[PDB]
Amino acid sequence: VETFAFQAEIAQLMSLIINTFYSNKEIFLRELISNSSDALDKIRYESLTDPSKLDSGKELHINLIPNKQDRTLTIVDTGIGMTKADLINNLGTIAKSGTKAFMEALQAGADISMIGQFGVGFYSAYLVAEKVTVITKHNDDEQYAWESSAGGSFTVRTDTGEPMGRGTKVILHLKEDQTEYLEERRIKEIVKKHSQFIGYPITLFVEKERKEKYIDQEELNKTKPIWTRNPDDITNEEYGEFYKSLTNDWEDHLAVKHFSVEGQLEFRALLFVPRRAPFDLFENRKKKNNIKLYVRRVFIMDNCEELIPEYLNFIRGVVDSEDLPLNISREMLQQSKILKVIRKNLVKKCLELFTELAEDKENYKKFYEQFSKNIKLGIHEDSQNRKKLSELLRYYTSASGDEMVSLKDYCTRMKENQKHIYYITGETKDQVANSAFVERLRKHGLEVIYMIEPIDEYCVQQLKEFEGKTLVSVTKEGLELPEDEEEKKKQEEKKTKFENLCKIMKDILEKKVEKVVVSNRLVTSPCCIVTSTYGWTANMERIMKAQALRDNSTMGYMAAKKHLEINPDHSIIETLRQKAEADKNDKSVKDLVILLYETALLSSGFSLEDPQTHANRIYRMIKLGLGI
Amino acid sequence: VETFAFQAEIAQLMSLIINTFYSNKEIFLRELISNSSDALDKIRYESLTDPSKLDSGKELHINLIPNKQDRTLTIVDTGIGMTKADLINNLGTIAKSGTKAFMEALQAGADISMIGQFGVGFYSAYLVAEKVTVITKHNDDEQYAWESSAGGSFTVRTDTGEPMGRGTKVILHLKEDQTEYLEERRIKEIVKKHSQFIGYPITLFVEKERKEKYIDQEELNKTKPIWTRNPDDITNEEYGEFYKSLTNDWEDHLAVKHFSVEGQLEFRALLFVPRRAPFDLFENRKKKNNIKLYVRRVFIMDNCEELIPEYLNFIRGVVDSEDLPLNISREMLQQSKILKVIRKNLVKKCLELFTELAEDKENYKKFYEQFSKNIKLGIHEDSQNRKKLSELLRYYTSASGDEMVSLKDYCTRMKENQKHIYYITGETKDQVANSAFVERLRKHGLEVIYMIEPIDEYCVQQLKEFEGKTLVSVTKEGLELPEDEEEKKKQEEKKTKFENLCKIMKDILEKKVEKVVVSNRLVTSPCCIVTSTYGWTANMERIMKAQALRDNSTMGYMAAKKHLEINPDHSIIETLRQKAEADKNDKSVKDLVILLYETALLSSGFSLEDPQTHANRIYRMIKLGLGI
Amino acid sequence: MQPASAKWYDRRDYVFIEFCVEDSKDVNVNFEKSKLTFSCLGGSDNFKHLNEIDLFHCIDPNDSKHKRTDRSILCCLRKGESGQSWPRLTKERAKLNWLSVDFNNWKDWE
Numbered sequence A, B: 001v002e003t004f005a006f007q008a009e010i011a012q013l014m015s016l017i018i019n020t021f022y023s024n025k026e027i028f029l030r031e032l033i034s035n036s037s038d039a040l041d042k043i044r045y046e047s048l049t050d051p052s053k054l055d056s057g058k059e060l061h062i063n064l065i066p067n068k069q070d071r072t073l074t075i076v077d078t079g080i081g082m083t084k085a086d087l088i089n090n091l092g093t094i095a096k097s098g099t100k101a102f103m104e105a106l107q108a109g110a111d112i113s114m115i116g117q118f119g120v121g122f123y124s125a126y127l128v129a130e131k132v133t134v135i136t137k138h139n140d141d142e143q144y145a146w147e148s149s150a151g152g153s154f155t156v157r158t159d160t161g162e163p164m165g166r167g168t169k170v171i172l173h174l175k176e177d178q179t180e181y182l183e184e185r186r187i188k189e190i191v192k193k194h195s196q197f198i199g200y201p202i203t204l205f206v207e208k209e210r211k212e213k214y215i216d217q218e219e220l221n222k223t224k225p226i227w228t229r230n231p232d233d234i235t236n237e238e239y240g241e242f243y244k245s246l247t248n249d250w251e252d253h254l255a256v257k258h259f260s261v262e263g264q265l266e267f268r269a270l271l272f273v274p275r276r277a278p279f280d281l282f283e284n285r286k287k288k289n290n291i292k293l294y295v296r297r298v299f300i301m302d303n304c305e306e307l308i309p310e311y312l313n314f315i316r317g318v319v320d321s322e323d324l325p326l327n328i329s330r331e332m333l334q335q336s337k338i339l340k341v342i343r344k345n346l347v348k349k350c351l352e353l354f355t356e357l358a359e360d361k362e363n364y365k366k367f368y369e370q371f372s373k374n375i376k377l378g379i380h381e382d383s384q385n386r387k388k389l390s391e392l393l394r395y396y397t398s399a400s401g402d403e404m405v406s407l408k409d410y411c412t413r414m415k416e417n418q419k420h421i422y423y424i425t426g427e428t429k430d431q432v433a434n435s436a437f438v439e440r441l442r443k444h445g446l447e448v449i450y451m452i453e454p455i456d457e458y459c460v461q462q463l464k465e466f467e468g469k470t471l472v473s474v475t476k477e478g479l480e481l482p483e484d485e486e487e488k489k490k491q492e493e494k495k496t497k498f499e500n501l502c503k504i505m506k507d508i509l510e511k512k513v514e515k516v517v518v519s520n521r522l523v524t525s526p527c528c529i530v531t532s533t534y535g536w537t538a539n540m541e542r543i544m545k546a547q548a549l550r551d552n553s554t555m556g557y558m559a560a561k562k563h564l565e566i567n568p569d570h571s572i573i574e575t576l577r578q579k580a581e582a583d584k585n586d587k588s589v590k591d592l593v594i595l596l597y598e599t600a601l602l603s604s605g606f607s608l609e610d611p612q613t614h615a616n617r618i619y620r621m622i623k624l625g626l627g628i
Numbered sequence C: 001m002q003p004a005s006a007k008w009y010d011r012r013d014y015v016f017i018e019f020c021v022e023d024s025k026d027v028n029v030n031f032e033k034s035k036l037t038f039s040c041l042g043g044s045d046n047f048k049h050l051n052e053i054d055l056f057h058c059i060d061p062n063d064s065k066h067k068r069t070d071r072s073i074l075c076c077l078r079k080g081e082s083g084q085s086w087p088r089l090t091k092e093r094a095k096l097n098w099l100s101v102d103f104n105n106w107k108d109w110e
Ligand SMILES: Nc1ncnc2c1ncn2[C@@H]1O[C@H](COP(=O)(O)OP(=O)(O)NP(=O)(O)O)[C@@H](O)[C@H]1O
Pocket: A031, A034, A035, A036, A039, A077, A079, A080, A081, A082, A090, A091, A096, A097, A098, A099, A100, A115, A116, A117, A118, A119, A120, A121, A122, A123, A167, A168, A169, A170
């Protein structure tokens, strides 16, 4: 048996790092700004126990210096620097991190946290660089230039140029096709996207004025990661300046949750409810999430639909963590089971935010006026939080004076005989409130919920019960009102004396209805069309008939069976009985019964199978009324 | 100046391959089956110039042997094998590929292509393995076992165990919680996902028959990569056997493209139209498309929204290439530019497929009766292709009966005076065909297109013109028909007769309509409600008022501005003129003008502003008629 | 002289700790109801590693174990109460810089 060390083919290993690790070239600037932020963290930490470490310079900062004339982008920091042996080790050895080897030397009380750990990110400079020169100056050694074009070798020499005092200065000589990184708009885009929360001022040096000889954009990160602070110490003004800076919004936030999760995962988050819903919130199918994931204040990913459910897509926010597993690119998270545990905690703390917001009625009105769809889509899609979300619902009702109430307020007003929450669904608040279905409910003073968005129909299908009270549509067959035995006897007499009329009307309305029945739910309307229980309501039927990308095959059986509910106390219906019991086949009964059915279809909120055959009935009645 | 060669820290470099390259563990079997398919391609190639290379064993196969008793998963491979120097070089050196070194030794005409090139794929074995033993024999050396835990060293020895003749055997000693990769269906899943199209039989040797001493699952890859053959040689049965194997559909494909793209980017593709639209085709918001991308017959990615636009998501297909730049994980590409140039060719050749399929009327009916939503969603989304996709459109019309006809058939039948393609939209062919708006089109013998699904209302926003003919809705203001100057003279005299009635009706209907006007689109209806040209149609409003996830303040800004059009020849209207000329404030005129507006809202396809307020008029006329 | 780099995770009954010492020698592990101690020599240079881990919750030394490999040393500790959640490896809230979670083998089992 012979034992061998593993080797590496350095020529092809460098080719992997340049050609295969990173899916976008722009990241080179976040890797070199991360290395500067680590070099600044190393000297900041070394200075805490020995102030003489800063005698060579006190101002810890980053400078980006695009030079369009030399096709060069220089990245300067006043960080720890590298001795000759640190250049030869840490820039000369692939997969060796001087950041890891420093971090692992420290005691557990150290308040430092550094972005680097793989020992590869410097090489990402060769995504854009034709050649890299790293000028450097540590406190304990001379100034050196390290220099390479990644040709399997690098050179080190004592630097005879301008004396740095202390720092590092990564000069990227850019490839001719990569001079876009020298445009100040480009650098601003890349630094804002990847690096706006790096703990040190990233100054950009731009141009001569038309005079400033070299205009500073004073900082590219003129903002602080406030989420790392204790949430008791931050006022709502400080959260508002951060919300505006994170989002570029001119308006404030409505509500904020700031929290930390601790365990196997440790993370912090800011979740903001924006003042107003984005005008494109559900039309913008591309921007699926408004949560950004950070690790050690460097951006990882945002538009990952695994971070929050699609109904929370309006929450603008930041999630940040010290120790998540990163892909070698650092452009994504490595373990998908972590997103599930983030998502569980984000959703739990969002629903805490909304129930803490619901205590403050005037702010809850401003919220629900714009995010009603999101709560209702949450009840449609989130079976776990459905209970918690049901207490966030707000609806108009027959007892509520152009104002919205919670299901707990409905249940507070429920009469002692009610075992059900009565709701109606429709097109407008007037169209439901005036409807035939609520006529006896309001006569008893039984309260009815008005549902009037299309999303209410997708919601209420999952909202089957609240606090042990079953939600029942007032537009479905066999509606049980809390009637007395004297009323039940009158209903059995009414079903008795109209039994023949229902058979006669079902002969005239054959195939147009499943049945014709005498009803407890009417007072002033002569009839209305309800549906059977097990299918689409008239409102769900109109809604599904308007979804462009739904397969028509489901509409052919989910469309519920129509029942015509007669009002036995109506003067039309009592006269119609006296005609129908005189002659079953009177043409004036045939005309009356079908005109009542078509008027009931409209009153009930269906469409007609042909509006013109109906209009021709009204135009005949108008001719007869005009004497034509 | 001092020059140094780059090094690598092998302890950390090995840890990057095991932790940060690969975000899913399951691919260890893909990499080891790819290394086996390359070792088989090497010995197959060497046997072409010297057949004696196979006298050590003439079969070329991959066997997988789970061994639950020992926790090992073995991968036997009757390939080229490795000499002692090839073990020490290619398994011992990270980022060294003996495949790349073999491939670059070949003559430029060599008819071969191998999956390996990076030189790291073998160490993905240590995702799941605590230890790996590679037992191997090459034609030119002894049998050796190479063995390592990835502990910064490996051992090699002259094995002299059971003799292999020529091949390799990777034995993965699995970690105690990675024994899921010994389950037969776990292996069946991973192989049929990643390695289904490897050019050699992958056999699985599992358990016992409960009778043979093991289940010899003769192939996991019974199917062949049919797309690598010449498109002219394959029959429709052979494309059908492949389509059923690729998709698990029980029926043949409806139509197929097979294309060979050559240039700087080279690929082959099979694109299949299913026999039927999937039950979840648009409902599945997770499945963006049914295209799988392969490189050298190994699966790279699926469900990538950059390969084809979401309107083509129904196309099942393979894309395969010899040449695309893979990410280090081999789970995506390094360049989005490659996906754009793929997508242009995929779309360009799908619209060829539909244009070729459109010549076979019976198969085109079987296609369009299911995928017409996709063509219309295409005309909505895809601005480059509307000129192509609008020749794929088929519709019913007022002169085709129940045949679906194209816009070119309409343009063939168009009367010599027609400057416009007239169309109408609604809920059903019966509502639309008998509508008030088409009465004079149908009287003049002008043809009208009938548009019936909600997606048709999106389609005609973008489909403004076909063959230089403007698409004109018959439900919008200013419908000038091709007409004679004597009929225009009489029409302006009819306007002149009715100006007082129009003003009296506008005073009654104030804010309910923008205008009241005499019109020529009617013949036997007394009036109809028509929209402004730049607002929503009566049907577009119905559809937008039913989209659940849309901001009603934002969309409702452009709601249907309504005009009432009067038929000046109707007996209702001439009588109503004589009443309105007798008294502008007659309560009879006020009733008929509101009842005609509400009847015209229905026959024109609007909802009523309150159906109950309307229904009470009909119930009133019934009470009066019955003498109640 | 300096702690070994460590990765850790848990299951309902067990707490797993991978001490990341390649080509390791002279590996010693001590289990006690309230503590773990680990030490070894590193294979590159014979540098002595020592980790003391005063544990977050109780463990069973009679059902706890360690496996040495040339890649790493894995300890598997028996929880003194199965179904105890471990939000941190040690009783102290100390941020041990050499210790992280093994997110290849971490799962939220609870
Ligand atoms: N601007 C700098 N100032 C001081 N030291 C630096 C600088 N840039 C790089 N280094 C050193 O180079 C080492 C290796 O750098 P690098 O290749 O970027 O990998 P890394 O940052 O350590 N880890 P990672 O970014 O996760 O790949 C660092 O750990 C430092 O020791």
